[PDB]
Design a protein around this ligand. Structure first.
Ligand SMILES: *C/C=C(C)/C=C/C=C(C)/C=C/C1=C(C)CCCC1(C)C
Ligand SMILES: CCCCCCCC/C=C\CCCCCCCC(=O)O
Ligand SMILES: CCCCCCCC/C=C\CCCCCCCC(=O)O
Ligand SMILES: CCCCCCCC/C=C\CCCCCCCC(=O)O
Ligand SMILES: CCCCCCCC/C=C\CCCCCCCC(=O)O
Ligand SMILES: [Cl-]
Ligand SMILES: [Cl-]
Length: 269
């Protein structure tokens, strides 16, 4: 459906290129589901005020892990090794599924940051609202732009610019709330949380770069690079980010007198 609107459909792949993509996607599944079990086990050491932040990482792990799994299966469904190359057999592969999944996962990532920032009540509700709207604005417009990556690069760029406005405004909201709420943070996490900001600015910026690959590297190796970029970006923005969020949740929990948190940190000290 969208499969012919993505540059992946244009090319035959060497076994090397094809299998590297398959393995990237598969390693990403393994990383997400491994991290899942960690987040799960460690949630008992998080105080009730913050426990939802760790639960949101579990949710993101399974959500992203399922899309990666699905991507790996669709990739192998779409191509068969015919006459010395992987050649397109049918219209099962599209990057569109990621974009659709971000509608759920980006709001989860954002919400767990707000939680550990100690926002509550009306401020939590209003901040999450504006952020989710700005995130949906960005994803929807990017989703549309990406439908033109084969036959209209100008259109890809302009939907991209529009998506970028949303991104920039969401980042402004994120950064403002981070920098204005640092002083509420317990246990030294005032310092940790600024590294979370930077990690997000880094990892999230990789996605617009992946998006632009059709404009600067429209060939089978740009297809590989795009998946590589997604892979680096997924693990950074979801796994590493989630581990830092969970660190911050446990650390604040212990500083606030939650005994299982204290015992957990004490027994790794
Ligand atoms: C786990 C997934 C995450 C954190 C996804 C993040 C996606 C973005 C920050 C996407 C950004 C885009 C632009 C700013 C412009 C081009 C279109 C997008 C949607 C790729
Ligand atoms: C921060 C997350 C790290 C992401 C892990 C990515 C793992 C692979 C890293 C480098 C491999 C580079 C070698 C690629 C050879 C390409 C083969 C080919 O395409 O012909
Ligand atoms: C657009 C939809 C926005 C829904 C916002 C979700 C709010 C998360 C929890 C905050 C709360 O209910 O106090
Ligand atoms: C790719 C583009 C990268 C864009 C922005 C962020 C990169 C820098 C992150 C460094 C960490 C800074 C810090 O911890 O103070
Ligand atoms: C070399 C690549 C570095 C990759 C970093 C990986 C995982 C780190 C994230 C876990 C959070 C640790 C808490 C930080 C702290 O103790 O202050
Ligand atoms: Cl609590
Ligand atoms: Cl996702």
């Amino acid at each position: 459906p969208n499969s012919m609107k993505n540059i992946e459909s244009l090319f035959d792949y060497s076994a090397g290129q094809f299998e590297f993509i398959d393995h990237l996607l598969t390693m990403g599944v393994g990383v997400h589901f491994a991290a899942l079990i960690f987040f799960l086990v460690v949630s008992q050491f998080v105080a009730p005020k913050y426990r939802i932040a760790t639960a949101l990482s579990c949710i993101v792990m399974v959500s992203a892990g399922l899309i990666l799994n699905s991507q790996a299966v669709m990739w192998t469904d779409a191509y068969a090794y015919v006459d010395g190359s992987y050649q397109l057999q049918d219209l099962t592969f599209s990057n569109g599924y990621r974009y659709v999944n971000w509608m759920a996962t980006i709001p989860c990532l954002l919400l767990q940051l707000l939680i550990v920032l100690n926002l509550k009540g009306k401020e939590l509700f209003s901040t999450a609202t504006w952020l989710i709207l700005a995130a949906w604005g960005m994803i929807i417009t990017g989703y549309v732009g990406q439908l033109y990556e084969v036959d209209d690069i100008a259109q890809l760029m302009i939907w991209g610019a529009v998506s970028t406005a949303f991104f920039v405004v969401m980042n402004w909201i994120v950064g403002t709330k981070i920098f204005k709420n640092r002083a509420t943070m317990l246990g030294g996490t005032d310092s940790t949380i600024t590294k979370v900001f930077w990690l997000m600015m880094f990892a999230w910026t990789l996605y617009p770069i992946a998006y632009l690959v059709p404009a600067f590297m429209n060939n089978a190796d740009g297809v590989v690079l795009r998946q590589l970029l997604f892979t680096i970006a997924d693990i950074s923005s979801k796994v590493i980010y989630g581990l830092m969020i969970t660190y911050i949740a446990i650390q604040q929990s212990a500083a606030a007198g939650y005994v299982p948190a204290q015992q957990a940190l004490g027994r790794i000290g």
